[PDB]
């Protein structure tokens with residue numbers, strides 16, 4: 001994969017709620033440093049909600065791929081609400097941009 | 105409705121297949137200039153497939169909003185494939201970025 005494009009994807013779609021760097025802060029979501037090979041729900045200092053902890057799954061390329069591919073199946077209600085809030089704002093911003101750009 | 109954020113979303117999520125500018129090129133998808141207030145399937149010069157045309161739907165703020173919220177209502181199988189191909193590439197670039205950034 002192209003890490004430079006992946007960086008832009010991460011900024012746009014995740015960085016509002018997650019940091020990746022060693023010792024980076026917990027925000028809406030947990031810091032993700034050390035994620036690869038860690039069991040779900042094991043970021044130190046982050047208060048997970050009921051669903052995430054009870055998996056027994058190890059994060060890696062393949063589990064991330066399945067996670068991202070059908071998030072609704074696996075994300076808990078809390079994150080679903082936060083994500084839906086961000087997606088509603090993104091839609092309104094996109095439509096705002098389109099009504100400007102396509103009529104300029 | 106933040107037009108500048110809307111632009112960034114458009115670049116990331118749509119600009120591979122769409123232009124918005126007057127006289128802008130048709131690419132995988134139709135140029136979008138003048139979209140608002142136009143019926144579905146009426147971009148001049150563009151070769152559509154069946155499942156979009158002859159709707160009688162007029163594009164606007166609300167129909168665009170529903171499109172983004174419920175794409176199954178509007179996107180044909182052809183576009184589903186193009187978008188699914190794109191999302192897979194996105195997932196691989198994001199995962200590649202994460203395996204670098206979360207291990208730095």
Ligand code: HEC
Nearest residue numbers: 013014017028029040041042043048049051052079082083
């Ligand atoms: C962009 C595509 C991403 C990616 C790759 C991830 N997120 Fe999130 N995340 C958020 C919250 C509140 C949680 C915890 C939910 C709970 O309490 O159980 C998470 C959790 C994750 C994980 C699991 C981490 C673990 O340590 O087990 C992963 C891998 C993850 N996220 C990746 C919050 C958000 C958002 C808030 C609106 C947004 C946007 C994202 N996350 C985006 C992404």
Ligand code: HEC
Nearest residue numbers: 117118121132133134144145146147152153156183186187
């Ligand atoms: C980013 C979220 C967007 C937005 C806002 C739109 N698209 Fe696409 N698009 C693609 C193709 C092949 C078509 C034609 C499908 C067919 O033959 O019917 C479209 C169509 C649209 C429309 C309808 C346009 C019309 O004139 O009726 C609209 C409003 C629209 N798009 C907006 C192809 C793609 C992609 C290829 C992988 C990508 C990505 C997008 N479109 C993204 C977006």
